[PDB]
Amino acid sequence: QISVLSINQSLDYLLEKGASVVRFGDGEMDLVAGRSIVYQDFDPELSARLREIMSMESDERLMVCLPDVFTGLERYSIDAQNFWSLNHLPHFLEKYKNICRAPWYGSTFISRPYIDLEDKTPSVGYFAKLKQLWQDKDLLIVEGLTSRSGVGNDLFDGARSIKRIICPSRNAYSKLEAIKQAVREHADNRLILTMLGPTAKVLVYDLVQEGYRALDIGHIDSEYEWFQMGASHKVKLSHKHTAEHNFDQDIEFRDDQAYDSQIVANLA
Amino acid sequence: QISVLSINQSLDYLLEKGASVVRFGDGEMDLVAGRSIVYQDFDPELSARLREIMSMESDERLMVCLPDVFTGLERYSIDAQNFWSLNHLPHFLEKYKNICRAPWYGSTFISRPYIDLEDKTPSVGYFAKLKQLWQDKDLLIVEGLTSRSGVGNDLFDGARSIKRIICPSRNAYSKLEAIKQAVREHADNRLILTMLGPTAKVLVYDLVQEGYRALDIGHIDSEYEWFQMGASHKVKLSHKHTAEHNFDQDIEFRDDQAYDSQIVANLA
Numbered sequence A, B: 001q002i003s004v005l006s007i008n009q010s011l012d013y014l015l016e017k018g019a020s021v022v023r024f025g026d027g028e029m030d031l032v033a034g035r036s037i038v039y040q041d042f043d044p045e046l047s048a049r050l051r052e053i054m055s056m057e058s059d060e061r062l063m064v065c066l067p068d069v070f071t072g073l074e075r076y077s078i079d080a081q082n083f084w085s086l087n088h089l090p091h092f093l094e095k096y097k098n099i100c101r102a103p104w105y106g107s108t109f110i111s112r113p114y115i116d117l118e119d120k121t122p123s124v125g126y127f128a129k130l131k132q133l134w135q136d137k138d139l140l141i142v143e144g145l146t147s148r149s150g151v152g153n154d155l156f157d158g159a160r161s162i163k164r165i166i167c168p169s170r171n172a173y174s175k176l177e178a179i180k181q182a183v184r185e186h187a188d189n190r191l192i193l194t195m196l197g198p199t200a201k202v203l204v205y206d207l208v209q210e211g212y213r214a215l216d217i218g219h220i221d222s223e224y225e226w227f228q229m230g231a232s233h234k235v236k237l238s239h240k241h242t243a244e245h246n247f248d249q250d251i252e253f254r255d256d257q258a259y260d261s262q263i264v265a266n267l268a
């Protein structure tokens, strides 16, 4: 009964208002139910902070997103439909309805705009509007050791410049205050992008309170790689993190000197 | 009946396929009916050429566009509804059905994404996808003397570089071969954008046959100015051409040194 914007309306709101964004997906609900996820062990301080931010209302300073799953599941792949309609919502729908009482939310799938869409025709337009958020911007990327967002592809080639804060690939929440301090030291006037699972959501909220603009964009790199491959399955990549292969086994980095030169702090 | 894509679907096609685009609006149908328009006098070679291009089918090399008016006019302002439904289509509907027999067409309103829309919420996203077509590209802009596309706004600030071929502000068709000659001399590998009324349509078509990529984007600058000012009416601008003020009275150019430096040929 919760009202969730489409991807097109969510991205347009970010383009219109310049708002920050924080997204909550199935893994955040897992932790709010007291259950660990693969790259974040359960932590009560984390779950309470996630439990708090989910209940917040959206405005021109910060848009809060939920999975666009409370209606029209025919939009998604048969595997995605089976997950939401037969696994997640049976468990947690009454939790969503209890906690999430804002008038409206953005779509958490602005990060996930390809592989699980039944019709992939509009994906090109989603990635185009995403790229417009950072076109000609100086960027601060806050991501984990294996994320390597944009490494090996042209996702961020339209940005003016990139600096990166490298965080733990898992259980990053225990270093949250150290990460925040690194962001303060290096952010200047840059747009902050974060790819950091549950920790990213607390990070964005906290940095918004300090007057930064930050976008939680999660697994955008994996979805972009699949989009460029024309993939039909969540094919695992060998040289960086892959969405829904969250244990990070069988990864060996390729030498990227541009990436290495963008690192300004390493907390992994 | 004729099947016309939405603006969202048309822009996504150009992003996906990299196709060139030609759009036909009410002024071209005016000429195909043997009538002069304000900035283009009747010429039998032009009108026959426009009718010929209108009848062509769209593909990954070239998308042919028509006004998205044969259905769902509730999408537009009442002024636009009255024009198409009581003025244009009463005269020319049987001509459209006779000439336009392709399976599908793009939307000519990819150039017109704001002032005549009833709901202006998605316009921000339309301009974002348009900007992505030329982001980080070297551009060759082919336009009339009063067009001054991008002058005084940030429409093309995301482009890598701009050269301009300046043409007659009206009756440009009489200089078509000289304009084409200028394009061959200065285009190199640049993306060609044209804002040149009915001559733009023949130009793009002819340039496609020679293996260039060209986008007929017409009155995009006026719609962007209205969008940025949040206008609710087609307010006339005093320092350049304004769409639907086509006689070009009462125009005094602002001195723009970037514009001046971008001109590489002048045929006005």
Ligand SMILES: O=c1ccn([C@@H]2O[C@H](COP(=O)(O)OP(=O)(O)O)[C@@H](O)[C@H]2O)c(=O)[nH]1
Pocket: A023, A025, A027, A039, A040, A111, A112, A143, A144, A145, A146, A147, A167, A168, A169, A170, A171, A172, A173, A195, A196, A197, A198, A199, A200, A217, A218, A219, A220, A241, A243
């Ligand atoms: O402690 C953590 C948790 C996650 N991640 C990264 O967070 C990203 C995914 O974030 P999120 O779960 O928000 O993605 P979504 O699937 O929601 O789009 C991936 O690049 C992971 O490597 C990380 O670096 N450290």
Ligand SMILES: O=c1ccn([C@@H]2O[C@H](COP(=O)(O)OP(=O)(O)O)[C@@H](O)[C@H]2O)c(=O)[nH]1
Pocket: B023, B025, B027, B039, B040, B111, B112, B143, B144, B145, B146, B147, B167, B168, B169, B170, B171, B172, B173, B195, B196, B197, B198, B199, B200, B217, B218, B219, B220, B241, B243
């Ligand atoms: O001989 C001409 C005819 C038109 N134009 C320009 O063509 C543009 C509009 O093109 P079009 O009619 O294709 O616009 P649309 O309304 O279809 O988007 C305006 O900038 C006009 O100044 C021009 O420079 N020379």
